[PDB]
Amino acid sequence: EELPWDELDLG
């Protein structure tokens, strides 16, 4: 369950 980014789109 990884994400393409880290703090690029968190809401």
Side-chain angles (χ1 to χ4, degrees):
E1 280 149 48
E2 216 229 311
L3 190 80
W5 56 81
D6 278 287
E7 188 226 281
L8 193 145
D9 265 321
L10 228 299

